[PDB]
Amino acid sequence: LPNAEDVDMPWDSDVFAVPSGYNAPQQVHITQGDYEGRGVIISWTTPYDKAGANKVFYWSENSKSQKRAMGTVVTYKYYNYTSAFIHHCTIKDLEYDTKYYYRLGFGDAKRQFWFVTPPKPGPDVPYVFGLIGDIGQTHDSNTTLTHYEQNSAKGQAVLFMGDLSYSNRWPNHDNNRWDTWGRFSERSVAYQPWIWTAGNHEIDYAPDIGEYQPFVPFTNRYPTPHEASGSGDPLWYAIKRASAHIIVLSSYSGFVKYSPQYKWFTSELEKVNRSETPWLIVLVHAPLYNSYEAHYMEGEAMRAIFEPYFVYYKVDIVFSGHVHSYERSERVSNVAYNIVNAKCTPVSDESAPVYITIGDGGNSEGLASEMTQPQPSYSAFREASFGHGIFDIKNRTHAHFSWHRNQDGASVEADSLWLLNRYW
Amino acid sequence: LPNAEDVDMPWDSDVFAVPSGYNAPQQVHITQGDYEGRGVIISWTTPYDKAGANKVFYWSENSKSQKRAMGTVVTYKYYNYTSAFIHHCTIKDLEYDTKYYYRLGFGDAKRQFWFVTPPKPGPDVPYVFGLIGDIGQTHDSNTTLTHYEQNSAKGQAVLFMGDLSYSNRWPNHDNNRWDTWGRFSERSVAYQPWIWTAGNHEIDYAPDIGEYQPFVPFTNRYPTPHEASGSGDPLWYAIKRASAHIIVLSSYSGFVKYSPQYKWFTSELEKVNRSETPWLIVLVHAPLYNSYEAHYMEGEAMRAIFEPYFVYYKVDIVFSGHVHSYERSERVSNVAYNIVNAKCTPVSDESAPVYITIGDGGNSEGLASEMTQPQPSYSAFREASFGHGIFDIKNRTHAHFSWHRNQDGASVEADSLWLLNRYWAS
Ligand SMILES: *[C@H]1O[C@H](CO)[C@@H](O[C@H]2O[C@H](CO)[C@@H](O[C@@H]3O[C@H](CO)[C@@H](O)[C@H](O)[C@@H]3O)[C@H](O)[C@H]2NC(C)=O)[C@H](O[C@@H]2O[C@@H](C)[C@@H](O)[C@@H](O)[C@@H]2O)[C@H]1NC(C)=O
Ligand SMILES: *[C@H]1O[C@H](CO)[C@@H](O[C@H]2O[C@H](CO)[C@@H](O[C@@H]3O[C@H](CO)[C@@H](O)[C@H](O)[C@@H]3O)[C@H](O)[C@H]2NC(C)=O)[C@H](O[C@H]2O[C@@H](C)[C@@H](O)[C@@H](O)[C@@H]2O)[C@H]1NC(C)=O
Ligand SMILES: *[C@@H]1O[C@H](CO)[C@@H](O[C@@H]2O[C@H](CO)[C@@H](O)[C@H](O)[C@H]2NC(C)=O)[C@H](O[C@@H]2O[C@@H](C)[C@@H](O)[C@@H](O)[C@@H]2O)[C@H]1NC(C)=O
Ligand SMILES: *[C@@H]1O[C@H](CO)[C@@H](O[C@@H]2O[C@H](CO)[C@@H](O)[C@H](O)[C@H]2NC(C)=O)[C@H](O[C@H]2O[C@@H](C)[C@@H](O)[C@@H](O)[C@@H]2O)[C@H]1NC(C)=O
Ligand SMILES: *[C@@H]1O[C@H](CO)[C@@H](O[C@@H]2O[C@H](CO)[C@@H](O)[C@H](O)[C@H]2NC(C)=O)[C@H](O)[C@H]1NC(C)=O
Ligand SMILES: *[C@@H]1O[C@H](CO)[C@@H](O)[C@H](O[C@H]2O[C@@H](C)[C@@H](O)[C@@H](O)[C@@H]2O)[C@H]1NC(C)=O
Ligand SMILES: *[C@@H]1O[C@H](CO)[C@@H](O)[C@H](O[C@H]2O[C@@H](C)[C@@H](O)[C@@H](O)[C@@H]2O)[C@H]1NC(C)=O
Ligand SMILES: *[C@@H]1O[C@H](CO)[C@@H](O)[C@H](O)[C@H]1NC(C)=O
Ligand SMILES: [Fe+3]
Ligand SMILES: [Fe+3]
Ligand SMILES: [Mn+2]
Ligand SMILES: [Mn+2]
């Protein structure tokens, strides 16, 4: 309630159409493949594993000669479900700020796409990031995506806050709905990388049907550039793109002191260089600050361990999803507590980041309407409406954030904020 | 912090001696194998995997007819280390409260041990649990264990709070020190089950030497009865023994709402029956209450999510380690906070368990001496001294806890508390 089977787009929806041709490459998507940006991971799925299905042809537009690469293939099973042949190809050492064309398939199944590598990492290098979370595959989900595509701000990459397909809401977590989501999202992710964050809907824990190990479907379908970041797990990693250093954290993985993620995270903080990448961005599914009734305080555990660091290294902004609505905080912190002093009230803090909740992509569960009352002072803006966001970096000191509602024009900003870098 | 290579017992120490005979079964240890208690998991390691090395012969003291079982074998690698053949045999459906003999090996390598299954689960069934945490393999570690063995209270099983071998403190986490620890602890774990709790020293995360996946050594050496508990992971599970229902949690695994462990834990709480097993015990490595300087507030994250439940289901007592010293709290809680009300002060709460910190088994890192000041009211007793503890269940309403320091006689109690069950005496 709402029932996924009643609100998600129909199986026959155009957006779920299978590309024609024998063994057509489908569910095509890419993501950054290296730490610097001249890398990419291209993913595509094929119903059969026959000669040719595992090859990518790519080439810069202003350089005729085309190179070919082979992917690594995998398949997985989940209850009575079996995947097709999933290919993942990691291409490195490309050129910065250059358009590339790549194609999959052969005969009349051949498909061509393109993408643009980001400019070399630098302090004043501008870049426009799209912001989406908890999209799923409902009719609202389609609207949200449509609006992002038409947004005059022209996003070059999407920072995704978690909860991709919501297929776990179907009987037996029907993995066929992961495939549909793959076809649906392809029109975007096939052209610009989506930087993944794992949400609780990617856990896919189902003892009832004998599936006790989490993230099996997600981990097999959406690889991450964790190794290049120094992480031995795909759920947590970091990349550098343009003037930003992005750290993606995992809400449902262990994160207390001494845990692998914690050790990786602290080391990563020390690798950050604000002189090269001014904008320090963090992604986590569950918000550390949320004043909505839904999932209220669920992020308290992580806030206890990580907030102190967010503030010490001066993260500029933190993006989260999970709560199906929108919210933006004031720069605040609650890191003075030691039990005895009883100091447990969030206070204005210019060394703290702005906290964003954008889990309103439109998944089947619907909007999270009820809010705590009255509005806490740490909250600057909160509205329950589907939409997407934009983080527009202009230079080392300015970046413009904005929220776009589906009721409004793709370019209309219902809320926005000009951020001043915390370091410059 | 002290150098492990300078304080841990020497490689040639008697306590590390390899049993004689061809392919001698070594590093023998057992733990409960089922949910009820009539189960056991026997583990032993053999340098070679030849016919016979994978068989256990076991029988009742009363019987003369001995049974035989085959184990499941595994080996693992860690950096430039390779394990021998590790065997794990899960024997089920034994008889309650009966002594059993079992033997491994052949020829003059043959070795015999014994253990005693617990009595059938019941409200007034008495039982004595030993308490140890962060023991490691130093000379103090040996003393601690010796004292437990001589303790007139006669513990029948050991609840272990985490951080077993501390071999990760040696160069490259030298897994050879896991083997030594296995021989050292054997004199006890081979006769009475140790109920494992995973500590940060079992994480064995070492990117520097290309080991990114945690718990590899621990998970391969010390199996857990998680499946019989409904858990798909060895780091978290529950068992019933005598009058107690024990829930073992994992501090370094995900534990927030919606996580596998969290879902397992909440379901497990609903399976608890205080009319069958009065004593609800919880084990976690990192203490939710600790007033020592070391690791101060490290357990705050878990307290935020789990404390509310500990109080609602009235856990009787919670045992932890991690802090190398001893501490016992008053029955308190801090579950009223909602941000806005600013209610963040621990307050006296008779519905809350007593929190115990016994990570003073004696590992190489030494004692955690500095304490926060002055002593917070939620703390009833705190002392930095090596030792072990005893949880003596007498009946559905009374259970006696006591702390034993290595400076004192195995039986001397430097601290103690008579607990009143929260369900039948509170
Ligand atoms: C693994 O097992 C699944 C068990 O749920 C199965 O789901 C389907 O199971 C049956 C078999 O097709 C479907 O059909 C109904 O079955 C009942 C049996 O009592 C019968 O009386 C009805 O007349 C009706 O035919 C179920 O509808 C369905 N489960 C549900 C409710 O979603 C999976 O197989 C499936 O079979 C068909 C339903 C296909 O259309 C797919 O849904 C699927 O293939 C099976 N795994 C797979 C291959 O998905
Ligand atoms: C189960 O739980 C308690 C564990 O020992 C047990 O102890 C209490 O009872 C003991 C006597 O039965 C008492 O000690 C005795 O004191 C007399 C007095 O002179 C002496 O002769 C004996 O040699 C013993 O020393 C313990 O002090 C007492 N424990 C405390 C301090 O709480 C419970 O005993 C209860 O049993 C009742 C039937 C009744 O005797 C109660 O008064 C007693 O507390 C025991 N409970 C049950 C169900 O038997
Ligand atoms: C694993 O790598 C270690 C070094 O990275 C090896 O240990 C080194 O062994 C040298 C001679 O064997 C010695 O001079 C070095 O000081 C020593 N360094 C260390 C880690 O202390 C190790 O080889 C083992 O060394 C010890 C542990 C011996 O007892 C034997 O177990 C081995 O010789 C390497 N493990 C391998 C490949 O067996
Ligand atoms: C919880 O555990 C107790 C102890 O095993 C169960 O009690 C049963 O019924 C009486 C109640 O006092 C008790 O004296 C018996 O020793 C015990 N007998 C059994 C095993 O049935 C208790 O009840 C269970 O059995 C009966 C009473 C049934 O109606 C229902 O209450 C339950 O199945 C156990 N309750 C549970 C399973 O949650
Ligand atoms: C999802 O929204 C898109 C808009 O981006 C819809 O795309 C239209 O698709 C039809 C074919 O079905 C094309 O002829 C139009 O040109 C597309 N319009 C746009 C604006 O691109 C799509 O139909 C929607 N899908 C569903 C199932 O509602
Ligand atoms: C942060 O990025 C700067 C631009 O790329 C770079 O200049 C900084 O390095 C500075 O200190 C050292 C490393 C020196 O070699 C020189 O590159 C600069 O003065 C860099 N910060 C660091 C320490 O890596
Ligand atoms: C960084 O981008 C900002 C957003 O477009 C832009 O306003 C900043 O320029 C401003 O500089 C200051 C000195 C102000 O007086 C005026 O000149 C501009 O608005 C720009 N910062 C840079 C690169 O100077
Ligand atoms: C450990 O203690 C035992 C007796 O408890 C003793 O025999 C042995 O020598 C001790 N080991 C060492 C080397 O400390
Ligand atoms: Fe969601
Ligand atoms: Fe320890
Ligand atoms: Mn979510
Ligand atoms: Mn520890």
Coordinates of C-alpha atoms in Angstrom, one line a residue, chain A residues 200 203 205 212-214 230-233 236 251-260 263-264 295-298 300-305 322 334 337-340 342-346 376 378, chain B residues 200 203 205 207 212-214 230-233 251-260 263-264 295-298 300-305 322 334 337-340 342-346 376 378:
Chain A
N200 CA 18.0 -0.6 1.4
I203 CA 19.7 -5.3 -0.1
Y205 CA 17.5 -10.0 1.7
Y212 CA 20.4 -14.6 2.9
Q213 CA 23.4 -12.8 1.3
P214 CA 22.5 -9.2 0.4
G230 CA 41.3 1.8 -2.7
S231 CA 38.2 0.1 -1.6
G232 CA 37.7 -3.7 -1.6
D233 CA 33.9 -3.4 -1.7
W236 CA 31.8 2.3 -0.7
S251 CA 24.3 3.0 5.0
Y252 CA 23.6 -0.7 5.3
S253 CA 27.2 -1.9 5.6
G254 CA 29.2 -1.9 8.8
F255 CA 30.6 1.6 9.5
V256 CA 31.7 1.9 13.1
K257 CA 35.4 2.5 14.0
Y258 CA 37.7 -0.3 12.9
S259 CA 35.3 -1.6 10.2
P260 CA 36.6 -1.9 6.7
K263 CA 39.0 2.6 7.7
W264 CA 38.6 3.2 4.0
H295 CA 12.4 7.0 8.7
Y296 CA 12.8 9.6 11.4
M297 CA 16.2 9.3 13.2
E298 CA 17.1 6.1 11.2
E300 CA 21.3 8.6 14.0
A301 CA 23.7 5.7 14.2
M302 CA 25.8 6.9 11.2
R303 CA 25.6 10.5 12.3
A304 CA 27.2 9.5 15.6
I305 CA 30.3 8.1 13.9
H322 CA 15.4 7.2 1.4
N334 CA 25.6 18.1 16.7
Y337 CA 27.9 15.4 22.9
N338 CA 29.9 13.2 25.4
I339 CA 27.0 11.9 27.4
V340 CA 27.9 13.8 30.6
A342 CA 24.2 16.6 27.8
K343 CA 25.0 18.7 24.8
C344 CA 22.7 17.2 22.2
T345 CA 21.2 20.1 20.3
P346 CA 22.1 20.8 16.7
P376 CA 12.9 22.2 13.4
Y378 CA 17.9 23.0 11.5
Chain B
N200 CA 37.6 -6.1 15.6
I203 CA 38.3 -8.4 11.1
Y205 CA 41.4 -6.3 7.1
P207 CA 44.7 -3.7 2.1
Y212 CA 40.1 -6.6 1.6
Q213 CA 37.5 -9.1 2.7
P214 CA 37.2 -9.4 6.5
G230 CA 17.9 -18.7 11.5
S231 CA 20.9 -16.5 10.6
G232 CA 22.7 -16.7 7.3
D233 CA 25.9 -15.3 8.8
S251 CA 29.6 -4.9 16.2
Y252 CA 31.5 -4.6 13.0
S253 CA 28.7 -5.8 10.7
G254 CA 25.9 -3.7 9.4
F255 CA 23.2 -3.3 12.1
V256 CA 20.9 -0.4 11.3
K257 CA 17.2 -0.9 10.5
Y258 CA 16.6 -3.1 7.3
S259 CA 20.0 -4.7 7.5
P260 CA 20.2 -8.5 7.6
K263 CA 16.1 -8.1 10.8
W264 CA 17.5 -11.3 12.2
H295 CA 37.2 3.4 22.9
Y296 CA 35.0 5.9 24.7
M297 CA 31.6 6.2 23.0
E298 CA 32.6 3.8 20.2
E300 CA 27.2 4.9 20.6
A301 CA 26.1 3.9 17.1
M302 CA 24.8 0.5 18.1
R303 CA 23.3 1.9 21.3
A304 CA 21.2 4.2 19.2
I305 CA 19.6 1.3 17.3
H322 CA 37.0 -4.4 23.6
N334 CA 19.1 6.5 27.4
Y337 CA 15.9 11.1 22.9
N338 CA 14.2 12.4 19.8
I339 CA 16.5 15.3 19.0
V340 CA 13.9 18.0 19.9
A342 CA 17.1 17.1 24.2
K343 CA 16.6 14.2 26.6
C344 CA 20.0 12.6 26.3
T345 CA 20.9 11.6 29.9
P346 CA 21.1 8.0 31.0
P376 CA 29.6 8.6 35.9
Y378 CA 25.7 5.0 35.4

